[PDB]
Write an enzyme that holds these catalytic residues in place. Structure first.
Site, PDB file in Angstrom:
ATOM      1  N   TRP A 105      -1.399  -6.596 -10.827  1.00 53.82           N
ATOM      2  CA  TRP A 105      -2.667  -7.022 -11.402  1.00 53.82           C
ATOM      3  C   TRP A 105      -3.407  -5.873 -12.082  1.00 53.82           C
ATOM      4  CZ3 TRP A 105      -0.293  -8.723  -7.150  1.00 53.82           C
ATOM      5  CH2 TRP A 105      -0.183 -10.101  -6.935  1.00 53.82           C
ATOM      6  N   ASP A 132       2.691 -21.504  -1.100  1.00 56.05           N
ATOM      7  CA  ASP A 132       2.177 -20.452  -1.972  1.00 56.05           C
ATOM      8  C   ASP A 132       3.097 -19.243  -1.875  1.00 56.05           C
ATOM      9  OD1 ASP A 132       0.667 -18.878  -3.651  1.00 56.05           O
ATOM     10  OD2 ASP A 132      -1.243 -19.336  -2.669  1.00 56.05           O
ATOM     11  N   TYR A 138       6.523 -45.532   7.827  1.00 57.92           N
ATOM     12  CA  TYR A 138       7.253 -45.386   9.081  1.00 57.92           C
ATOM     13  C   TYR A 138       7.746 -43.958   9.280  1.00 57.92           C
ATOM     14  N   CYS A 167      -0.479 -15.046 -10.272  1.00 56.55           N
ATOM     15  CA  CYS A 167      -0.666 -16.335  -9.613  1.00 56.55           C
ATOM     16  C   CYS A 167       0.103 -17.471 -10.286  1.00 56.55           C
ATOM     17  CB  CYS A 167      -2.171 -16.640  -9.536  1.00 56.55           C
ATOM     18  SG  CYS A 167      -2.896 -17.441 -10.813  1.00 56.55           S
TER      19      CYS A 167
END
Ligand SMILES: [Ca+2]
Ligand SMILES: [Ca+2]
Ligand SMILES: [Ca+2]
Lengths: 6, 678
Positions: free
Chosen positions: B265, B376, B518, B300
């Site tokens: 980042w 994630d 179910y 991300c």
């Protein structure tokens, strides 16, 4: 994706 | 040794002689395979019926729990009186039957439900044609095929032939598969669609990034199996979608496991590709397979883009969600601790975050927590020692039942954590985190608001009660039992409070009533109510909420059950009592008999018998018979049916299926059926 001021 | 590599293979002998076989034995007495056909072409029935014609791959690709056709050519015509053979599917270097990695497929006369078997359907010349059925829980991967002929001296197996290797994938089309999705439109979008859109930006300024998942392109499928091989994931668990999704959520990021993508980042992204540069998943995954080392870089939306490919490629239905104002909790308190102050504060909040959702049943959780699971791969926090997240049940996050694995409290904090400006407090914000969650719509590039799946609307009391329940994972007991629930009739839901203290309490609570399948997959919420009850000291109070039949009869399915959420807060002490329970409706049925010869051109008596299932008095009973080709529709009325009394209706008719239906004043829409041949 930036970190944002609180 | 551990058997955790699809690439690795053992060597299966071609002459498995047993004991001291005498010299001069003649194995020509027995069958041998001259050729095997898999009809693997992408226009033939196998790939089309199994929804695998898209894969750019020249090998047979089937989905588990479904039938596909093969042909075996023998040296002489197969004779059941003297010949005995079986088909084998083998995976890994250490294949055992009890581990699921050596699969004997016996030649049977009738295929059985959910069992491996092969049935002959053609016998022309020296060829037999087989319909092979896989187990709906089979390991997913690339198998090696063999034909094994049994002789008194051993088994005569075919030699290794990689052209007969067969991929067996997850089957979202087979109702016996954990990834079953009873919607063709949803299946085409969450499985067969190889492109899509990802949303990002701010809540009020929303941008759209398109992504080429490319799960059907050459190399991607093998890569996904390689991703599982690199994880050292034991092969015996690659049929369980919960394990496959959790292993994927770790292996997509390069942390602690040499995964696919490296997160960065830092605005520089040295010696690599910037996150904003990627437009799809094919080039990341293929470079992973070629270089055998992680790819740089990703953020991300790129982790989700690759994780989405991994899931759809194997067959697990998957979509990408975007959470605007996603919170990052660092100390696992499910709060945003705000101290401003940059040294003491460690909790952050992103403008948006992207994670994946995978469709599967959760047999490891109670009934009602299936369907969409949040996963994630983006590295944010550790989970049990690794950088992974999920599968967390979106349903469990909605009602604050974050005690169900995996990593539900983290995902809850990302979507609905409150802000706590903290020794001493000050302000508390409760609407800032998780303002909007979105995903690509079906049949278009629009934006489907799915915020209501993760949390109740901010402001409503159920939002707070759900949150305070999640934060929890005064001498008051709380329970609820369902009062004689019969399909087609109103029933009472009796919440009970026992106060053993000498204090008077006030209780606020909400009730959530849901129809589930179910298997345990949720369908819809048909009733939601908030209520307030006062608890006098040393008392018991049985508040009973009535569920009218018209509230749930509109959204019912075969063998559906009822899941109830009841969360109550003790106002005086701020304690929260929460229970969840499942119940199956006592379903009445109609018995339909046919007496006489059931041919065309002659009358026959259709007998309809119904038994009164309630302790009440049934009045104005209407019974309807329907059966196209047998009898025109007719109706027999019954002005009264006494409790536990049986009624019989005879109807002559000259002629296929017969369907009956009863409907009275206190019990409506109870059916029966009968298949008749004519
Ligand atoms: Ca990892
Ligand atoms: Ca915190
Ligand atoms: Ca909130």
């Amino acid at each position: 994706x930036l970190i944002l001021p609180w | 040794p551990p058997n955790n590599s699809n690439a690795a293979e053992d060597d299966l002998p071609t002459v498995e002689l047993q004991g001291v076989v005498p010299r001069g034995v003649n194995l020509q007495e027995f069958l041998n395979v001259t050729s095997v056909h898999l009809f693997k072409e992408r226009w033939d029935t196998n790939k089309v019926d199994h929804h695998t014609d898209k894969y750019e791959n020249n090998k047979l690709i089937v989905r588990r729990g479904q039938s596909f056709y093969v042909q075996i050519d023998f040296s002489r015509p197969y004779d059941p009186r003297r010949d005995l053979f079986r088909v084998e599917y083998v995976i890994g270097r250490y294949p055992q039957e009890n581990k699921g990695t050596y699969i004997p497929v016996p030649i049977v006369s009738e295929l059985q439900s959910g069992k491996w078997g092969a049935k002959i359907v053609m016998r022309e010349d020296r060829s037999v044609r087989l319909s092979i059925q896989s187990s709906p829980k089979c390991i997913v991967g690339k198998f090696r095929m063999y034909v094994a002929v049994w002789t008194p001296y051993g088994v005569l197996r075919t030699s290794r032939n990689p052209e007969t290797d067969t991929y067996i994938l997850f089957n979202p089309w087979c109702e016996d598969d954990a990834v079953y999705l009873d919607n063709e439109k949803e299946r085409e979008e969450y499985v067969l669609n190889d492109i899509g859109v990802i949303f990002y930006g701010e809540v009020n300024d929303i941008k759209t990034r398109s992504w080429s998942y490319g799960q059907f392109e050459d190399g991607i499928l093998d890569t996904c199996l390689y991703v599982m091989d690199r994880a050292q994931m034991d092969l015996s668990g690659r049929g369980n979608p919960i394990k496959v999704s959790r292993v994927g959520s770790a292996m997509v990021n390069a942390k602690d496991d040499e995964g696919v993508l490296v997160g960065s980042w830092d605005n520089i992204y040295a010696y690599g590709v910037p996150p904003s540069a990627w437009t799809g998943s094919v080039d990341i995954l293929l470079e992973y397979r070629s270089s055998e080392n992680p790819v740089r870089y990703g953020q991300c939306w790129v982790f989700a883009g690759v994780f989405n490919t991994f899931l759809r490629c194997l067959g697990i239905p998957a979509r990408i969600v975007t959470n605007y104002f996603s919170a990052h909790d660092n100390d696992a308190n499910l709060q945003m601790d705000i101290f401003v102050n940059s040294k003491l504060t460690k909790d952050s909040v992103w403008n948006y975050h992207c994670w994946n959702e995978a469709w599967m049943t959760r047999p490891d959780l109670p009934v009602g927590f299936g369907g969409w699971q949040a996963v994630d791969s983006t590295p944010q926090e550790n989970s049990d020692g690794m950088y992974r997240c999920g599968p967390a049940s979106v349903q469990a996050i909605k009602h604050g039942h974050v005690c169900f694995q995996f990593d539900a409290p983290f995902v809850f904090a990302e979507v609905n954590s409150d802000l706590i400006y903290i020794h001493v407090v000050e302000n508390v914000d409760a609407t800032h985190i998780g303002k909007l969650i979105v995903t690509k719509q079906i049949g278009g590039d629009g934006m489907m608001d799915i915020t209501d799946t993760y949390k109740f609307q901010e402001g409503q009391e159920e939002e707070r009660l759900a949150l305070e329940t999640a934060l929890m994972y005064s001498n008051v007991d709380m329970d609820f039992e369902v009062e004689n629930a019969v399909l087609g009739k109103d029933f009472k839901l009796s919440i009970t409070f026992r106060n053993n203290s000498h204090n008077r309490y006030t209780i606020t609570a909400y009730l959530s009533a849901n129809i589930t399948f179910y298997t345990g997959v949720p369908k819809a919420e048909f009733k939601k109510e908030t209520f307030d009850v006062t608890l006098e000291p040393l008392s018991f109070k049985k508040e009973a909420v009535l569920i009218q039949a018209g509230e749930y009869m509109g959204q019912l399915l075969e063998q559906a059950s009822l899941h109830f959420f009841v969360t109550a807060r003790i106002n005086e002490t701020r304690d929260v009592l929460a229970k969840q329970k499942s119940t199956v409706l006592t379903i009445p049925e109609i018995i339909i008999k046919v007496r006489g010869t059931q041919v065309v051109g002659s009358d026959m008596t259709v007998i309809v018998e119904f038994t009164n299932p309630l302790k009440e008095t049934l009045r104005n009973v209407w019974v309807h018979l329907d059966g196209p080709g047998v009898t025109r529709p007719m109706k027999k009325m019954f002005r009264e049916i006494r409790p536990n009394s049986t009624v019989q209706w005879e109807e002559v008719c000259r002629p296929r299926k017969l369907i009956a239906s009863m409907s009275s004043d206190s019990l409506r829409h109870v059916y029966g059926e009968l298949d008749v041949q004519i």
